[PDB]
Structures are given as structure tokens and as C-alpha cells.
Amino acid sequence: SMEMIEKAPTDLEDRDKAPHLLLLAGIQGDEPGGFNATNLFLMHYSVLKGLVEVVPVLNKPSMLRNHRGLYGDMNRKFAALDKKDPEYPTIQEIKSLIAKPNIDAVLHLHDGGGYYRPVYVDAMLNPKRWGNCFIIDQDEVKGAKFPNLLAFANNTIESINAHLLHPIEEYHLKNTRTAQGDTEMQKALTFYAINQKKSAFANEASKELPLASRVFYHLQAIEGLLNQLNIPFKRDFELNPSSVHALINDKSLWAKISSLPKIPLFNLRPRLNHFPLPHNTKIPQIPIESNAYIVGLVKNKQEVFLKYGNKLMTRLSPFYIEFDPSLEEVKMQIDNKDQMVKIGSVVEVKESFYIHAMDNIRANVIGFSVSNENKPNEAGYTIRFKDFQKRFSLDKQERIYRIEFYKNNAFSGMILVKFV
Numbered sequence: 001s002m003e004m005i006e007k008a009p010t011d012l013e014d015r016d017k018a019p020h021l022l023l024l025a026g027i028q029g030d031e032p033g034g035f036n037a038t039n040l041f042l043m044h045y046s047v048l049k050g051l052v053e054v055v056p057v058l059n060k061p062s063m064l065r066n067h068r069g070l071y072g073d074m075n076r077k078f079a080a081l082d083k084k085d086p087e088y089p090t091i092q093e094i095k096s097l098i099a100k101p102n103i104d105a106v107l108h109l110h111d112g113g114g115y116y117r118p119v120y121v122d123a124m125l126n127p128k129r130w131g132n133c134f135i136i137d138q139d140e141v142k143g144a145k146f147p148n149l150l151a152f153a154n155n156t157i158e159s160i161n162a163h164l165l166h167p168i169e170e171y172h173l174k175n176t177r178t179a180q181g182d183t184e185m186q187k188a189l190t191f192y193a194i195n196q197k198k199s200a201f202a203n204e205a206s207k208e209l210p211l212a213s214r215v216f217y218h219l220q221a222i223e224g225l226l227n228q229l230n231i232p233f234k235r236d237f238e239l240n241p242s243s244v245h246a247l248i249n250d251k252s253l254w255a256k257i258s259s260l261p262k263i264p265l266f267n268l269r270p271r272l273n274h275f276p277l278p279h280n281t282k283i284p285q286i287p288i289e290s291n292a293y294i295v296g297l298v299k300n301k302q303e304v305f306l307k308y309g310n311k312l313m314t315r316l317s318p319f320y321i322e323f324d325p326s327l328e329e330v331k332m333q334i335d336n337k338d339q340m341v342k343i344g345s346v347v348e349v350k351e352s353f354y355i356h357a358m359d360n361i362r363a364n365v366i367g368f369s370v371s372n373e374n375k376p377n378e379a380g381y382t383i384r385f386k387d388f389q390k391r392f393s394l395d396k397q398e399r400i401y402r403i404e405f406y407k408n409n410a411f412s413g414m415i416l417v418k419f420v
Ligand SMILES: CC(=O)N[C@H](CCP(=O)(O)C[C@H](CCC[C@@H](N)C(=O)O)C(=O)O)C(=O)O
Pocket: 028, 068, 075, 108, 110, 111, 112, 113, 130, 135, 185, 188, 189, 190, 191, 201, 202, 204, 207
């Protein structure tokens, strides 16, 4: 499931006042520098004139399984391609985006092994390697709005190289001269883009780097190219590895699975047991939202993994059940104050809470018990933090607990309490 997300000026009229960039990553699922950068770009930047269209992850199924490409290398499917290829439709969607008349330039992000050098030094540093280089298929594209690929590349490279963390990380130009014999790159995305008279570029971050460093360089390259294109932008943070790491590991990130409440991405217990998921729904079809763009669910044996890029945030041991949407809100007392709490809410609790009984609805407070029934009703109990078995918390910090409602063998929804 790849989506395109626009990063545009607040005022629609400003869209045509500067060029348009198509920014792409995650065509290969084990290159997280690229799709973490597109993610952070979407979450923390603003484009003030022109437009940046972003496909944050082109190959999401492969991303979810930390795999270069489940159905082959998707970046070899832009030339000859059989209609029966499972990715044939995705490729047409990608081509269609690339070929839009509003698009001027294309930037395609990758992580690559070793460090590219224009002459052979050793097994890690040589022309066959891909890390930390800026790539063009040829030095010019006649017919393009911006035909001088070489000049844009050199200047972007100079911009990146002003901010090296270590000298081995210096960027070099890699012109693959694709039309002159590079049969593999002849099948790849940027060459397809060149043939639509777009100014196309790929940026590589070395797989030898830590993710934060890869994303740092990818963002340098994005900013460098936006500067060349004169697409003005802002970000709400300072571009250094420390800030990038902090934003990747942002504790305000959340995931909302189906109609369940938002759960934090970070500091979940490694496994969440008896986790209710909708009856007879394919995992890729379970709605999932997040304030990040690279979150998803994927089946693994009898578990369902919650993924944030290539990162495994938790293992769900599901409980497949009918999601009855009839129950919209529940009467709860929170710290002595009676109130209606919408199903799928997170409520903060300082001292105590109490669930009011409902006629045909039972409530299970996960981590609280009075008897030992396999289908209990724990409405009518005044509950404090000291009443919880802490190991049933969603989080390592032992502060967030599930309340699960049932209307006779159907799941009526869930509310989380967070003790603050
Ligand atoms: C097997 C293994 O891991 N190979 C990898 C290969 C690393 P890459 O996938 O980033 C290298 C190139 C980039 C194409 C650039 C340009 N023509 C474009 O279309 O964007 C590719 O897509 O094939 C590695 O060495 O790390």
C-alpha cells in the first residue's frame, strides 16, 4: 500500500510559484535510511512555494518484511515487464506519478553497501559500491525544465559535503552513463524519469552507517536539491544526527489499529497477548493510522507484527473476534469525576477510576481481577494503580492498561487508562 502525500504551501496559488519535486524512497524494503528520511520530511518540514510530492515507501510489503524485494527488485521493473508480474500495477502508478506534467524533478533515495569511490581502493571502497554518492544517468537531459543534471548534482554534492560527520563519508558523483551500456540501470526508475524529460537523481546513504546517520545524509541531499530547485522550505528542528535520532525515536509516535485506541509506538512490551483484531479481515486490510508514514502490520506465524519501518515495535498475539460498533461511549468515573468516555479513547488517571455497569456490556480491566472467571465483569469496582498486576501493562513503564468491552461474544471496543 503506497500512497503519495503532498507537501504544499498553505495557499494553493503558491504551488505554481516554484518547481515541483517528486521524492521517492523504499523501492527496496531493507533500505531504511530512505524511507525514514521521507517519513521525517513529511512529518517535520514545510514547503512554502512549489510542491514536493512524496511517496515515502514505494515497496511497503517488502519494507514490512525487511526485504530488498519480495516480488523481485522493483527497481528493475521500469523497462520490459510482464503484465502478470505482481507489481505491474504498482509500477504503472509510479510511472504515472513520474510522468505527470507538473513534475519537474525526481529524487530517489537508497541505502547502499560500502562507500562509492570513482576508482578502486578496496572491497568496501570502489566503483561497484553504492554508499554515499549522488547519482545521475547522464550529465544532461534535453527537453527538461532543468536540463543540467551535472550542475545540480555537483552543487548538491558540495552542499552535503559541507556537513560530513567523518571524512570517509564524503559524497562523490556517480554518473552511470546508463544509455551507454548499463543494462541494469536501463531497467531502473531514474532512467525511466529521464526518458520523460524529468531531471532525475538518486541519493545513496551507506548501509555501513547507523540509521540516524543515513537519514541525516538523505535529508542533506533533499535540502541540497530543494536549494538548487529554489523550492523554499522550513523544518522545526536542527539538522544534526542527535536531533534526527530523537525524531526517529519520537515517543509521541502512535499507531491506531482499527477502531482501537492509539497505542504508543515506543516502549511497548515486546508482546501483547490476547489482542483483539477484527473477524475475517486480511491483515493488510486492517485499517491502521499513525502520525508517522511508515507504520504497518504484518503476519508472522501466529503473531501480527507492528512495524515502524524495519523496526519491530511489538508482537501482537491476536484474538480474532467480531467488532461490534454499537457501543460508542461508556460512563466512567475518573478521579471522582463522572464522565462519558468515547470507545477508543485514552484517558489519563491520577488516582482512580470506576466503570459504571451496563446492561448487556461486560468490561474486562486487563491486569485487574477479583475472582478467576474466564469471562469477567469488572464494572462496579473502584480501581487504583496499586490494584494492577503491572506485567499486564501495554508499556514497559507499567502505566498504560487496557479496558476491553464485550457485548456477548462480540468485541465492543477498548479504552486505555494511563496512570500519570
Ligand atoms: C544485493 C544488494 O544488497 N544490493 C544493494 C544495491 C544498492 P541500491 O539498490 O541502492 C543500487 C541501485 C540504485 C539505482 C540508482 C538509480 N538508477 C535509480 O533508479 O534510483 C539499485 O536500485 O539497484 C547494495 O549493494 O546495498
